[PDB]
Design a protein around this ligand. Sequence first.
Ligand code: NAG
Length: 153
Amino acid sequence: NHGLRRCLISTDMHHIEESFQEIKRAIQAKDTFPNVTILSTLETLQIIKPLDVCCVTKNLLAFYVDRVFKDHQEPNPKILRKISSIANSFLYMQKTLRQCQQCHCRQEATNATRVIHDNYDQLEVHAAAIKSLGELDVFLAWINKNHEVMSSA
Ligand SMILES: *[C@@H]1O[C@H](CO)[C@@H](O)[C@H](O)[C@H]1NC(C)=O
């Protein structure tokens, strides 16, 4: 049913949000293409129906885990510790989502997702990874609006 919005309830948005707030300035300060958004799809209302939101959520989690987190090399240990915490949260969110799931990807959801990979691939890889990292607020806002998520805020 609409329950697909309950697959991340065990995730604590506040936890991720806080870890991110800690490095948000330092990471966003390195965004070399501010006039553009890698998560452009998440600034539109193209993905709002339950089934599409579930598909895009799992695609975005994989986008971060398999692409962003692999591509960003972080020499600052304090920043890396925060990003590890976020990464750990995302791994949990993927675990939770597995447990849940329907969640199939209709062609519109799939395309919405490819747009992001396509924007990402427009940039040099390290700039793409740090910029994506900087857009975590766009990702958290979208997750927040489309899922019953818990907050210890
Ligand atoms: C991004 O910035 C450029 C710079 O002039 C401007 O055309 C507009 O604000 C944006 N352009 C696009 C479509 O990326």
